[PDB]
Amino acid sequence: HMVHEATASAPVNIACIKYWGKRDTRLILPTNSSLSVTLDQDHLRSTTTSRADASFEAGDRLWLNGREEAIKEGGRLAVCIKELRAWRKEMETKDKNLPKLSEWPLRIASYNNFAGLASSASGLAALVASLASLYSLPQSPSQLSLVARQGSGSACRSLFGGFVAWREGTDPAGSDSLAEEVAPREHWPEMHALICVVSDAKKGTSTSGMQKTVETSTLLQERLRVVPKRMDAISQAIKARDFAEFAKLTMADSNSFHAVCLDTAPPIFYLNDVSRAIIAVVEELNRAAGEIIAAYTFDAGPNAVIYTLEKNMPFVLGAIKRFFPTSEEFESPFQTGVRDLPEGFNTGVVREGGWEKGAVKGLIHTRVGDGPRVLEKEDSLLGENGVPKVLA
């Protein structure tokens, strides 16, 4: 009984130039280009096993984190599977001797090792990489990113390692809305990142959200004029390894994104009081250093990502650890240490009384990473009958 199965992981990525707004909601074509750093799969990843077998019971089945997920026709997962099956069928049409993998049911199981960390970009990228390997697709990562983009917009940027653009494109059919390497991981491997996972228990109760910004935010129209300039500038900065300009652009575009969220009617809020305190600390770190050594950025929630070159991570750790005692124990994967605040650091930028333990829940030290990884049989999430090994 021959087994046709592939397992792949894909990385998380954190946008420096933010995706926020679609011009086509079905194809997921964006209102502007975006640009991200791919993070190290040694620390954060999604992993997906896909198997096709002529003897599986009819109908595809998919599990996420051990719970079966319905694959409704037309939805994000179904569309991705349909496009990748079509590319496999094309191979079979050209070479009639190939086994007819495209005709068989799929069994798919995925897990991430993650807090409020956005899991859809790495998750859909892992699905695409896994199925592309299962089907031995000839398509390039760029071509595969067209499919990932339709599962979840920022998933397309997780098809590459290093520093990665999503080019907005101008084709109404989306053929040029895809990811592109701006610089590979080996160009600037010292780019590290500290993720600050923030408690968010004082609020009430993104795809629906960002379209409300498109519909109602007057300030968004100026953001769309500014983003191309930041794309060009941050690409130059990465190519030049100019950390200060990379950092300035990253902080400016993060704040720009949260600004147009605030300008939405009704307003959209993601930063919380802890997020703002982390910004104050990073801003004061750069000021006291007399040099921009760290850059915060925030996606659609209060967690901070702080970019810094490895050599300056002890300053970032020192500042965060000084003001934000964590409930989770912290070990750097590299045993990176902690340095005292630069002389002149104004501790008054943090509230009187400080922050209670757990206001920041925990820290994750990671760095710029490679693209998706095809794994070995040993890593499979599926048992011998095609049902996941772990069911929640």
Ligand X SMILES: Nc1ncnc2[nH]cnc12
- Residues that bind a second copy in the complex, under the rule CB under 8 A: 201-205, 218-219, 221-223, 226, 248, 251-252, 255-256, 258-260, 262-267, 269, 272-273, 276-277, 279-280, 283, 348-353, 355
- What is the smallest separation between the CB atom of 367 and a second copy, expressed in angstroms? 26
Pick what 256 binds: a second copy, ligand X, none; C-beta below 5 to 8 Å, kind-dependent.
a second copy
Q: Does 123 bind ligand X (CB under 6 A)?
A: yes
- What is the smallest separation between the CB atom of 341 and a second copy, expressed in angstroms? 14
Q: Does 119 bind ligand X (CB under 6 A)?
A: yes
Q: Does 126 bind ligand X (CB under 6 A)?
A: yes
Site for ligand X in 32-51 (CB under 6 A): 46, 48
- What is the smallest separation between the CB atom of 305 and ligand X, expressed in angstroms? 19
Distance separating alpha carbons of residues 170 and 108, to the nearest angstrom: 34
Distance separating alpha carbons of residues 109 and 65, to the nearest angstrom: 8
Distance separating alpha carbons of residues 136 and 133, to the nearest angstrom: 5
Q: Which stretch binds ligand X (CB under 6 A): 122-130, 164-172, 176-184, 283-291?
A: 122-130
Pick what 94 binds: ligand X, a second copy, none; C-beta below 5 to 8 Å, kind-dependent.
none
Q: Does 112 bind ligand X (CB under 6 A)?
A: yes
Nearer to ligand X, 118 or 249 (CB): 118
Q: The tokens of 314 are what?
A: 């002890």
Nearer to a second copy, 85 or 248 (CB): 248
Q: Does 64 bind ligand X (CB under 6 A)?
A: yes
Q: The tokens of 269 are what?
A: 């809020």
Nearer to a second copy, 276 or 311 (CB): 276
Nearer to ligand X, 47 or 312 (CB): 47
Nearer to ligand X, 36 or 46 (CB): 46
- What is the smallest separation between the CB atom of 302 and a second copy, expressed in angstroms? 10
Nearer to a second copy, 104 or 315 (CB): 315
Pick what 112 binds: ligand X, a second copy, none; C-beta below 5 to 8 Å, kind-dependent.
ligand X
Question: What phi and psi, each to the nearest 5 degrees, are found at residue 91?
Answer: -60, -40
Pick what 71 binds: a second copy, ligand X, none; C-beta below 5 to 8 Å, kind-dependent.
none
Pick what 223 binds: ligand X, a second copy, none; C-beta below 5 to 8 Å, kind-dependent.
a second copy
Residues binding ligand X (CB under 6 A): 46, 48, 64, 110, 112, 119-120, 123-124, 126-127
